Design a protein around this ligand. Structure first.
Ligand SMILES: NC(=O)[C@H]1CCCN(C(=O)Cc2ccccc2C(F)(F)F)C1
Ligand SMILES: [Zn+2]
Length: 139
């Protein structure tokens, strides 16, 4: 679990969104596993606007942060779940690093700010849903 709080917005994994998130919906995209809801308090985080391919992510299953090199946002496949079916998740970045169920929501950051959140993983890999193209989170 985990979320990005920026201004009057909360960004979470779509498969983990709450009833409150859906009742205060701003935007959602099942193909990206993202959902953004509105909040009444000002958010604690800053968003990166860059093309960094190195950064640090939080891994709940190890209670530790790890440095990673990650790929450019692209399409990757993800098997079924209580949430989705075999598809090409878009805007997804892969990295060599640990992840397991329960790790979604961990933040990935570079020197410019928040890059995205853990959304996929498997066999020594970890996938992050990018948020750097969501320019509207700031204005
Ligand atoms: N974006 C999705 O469709 C995810 C929905 C939940 C399930 N999902 C996963 O990949 C679950 C998984 C499996 C092995 C290692 C790590 C994970 C992690 F990080 F939790 F995502 C896929
Ligand atoms: Zn950056």
């Amino acid at each position: 679990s985990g979320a990005i709080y920026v201004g009057n917005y909360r960004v979470v994994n779509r498969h983990l969104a709450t009833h409150n998130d859906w009742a205060n919906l701003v935007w959602e995209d099942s193909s990206r596993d993202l959902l953004v809801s509105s909040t009444t308090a000002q958010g604690c985080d800053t968003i990166a606007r860059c093309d960094c391919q190195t950064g640090v992510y939080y891994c709940s299953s190890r209670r530790k942060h790890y440095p990673v090199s990650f790929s450019k946002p692209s399409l990757i496949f993800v098997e079924a779940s209580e949430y989705y079916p075999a598809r090409y998740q878009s805007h997804l970045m892969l990295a060599v690093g640990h992840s397991e169920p329960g790790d979604c929501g961990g933040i990935l950051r570079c020197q410019h700010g928040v890059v995205g959140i853990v959304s996929t993983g498997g066999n020594g890999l970890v996938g992050f849903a990018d948020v750097r193209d969501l320019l509207w989170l700031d204005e």
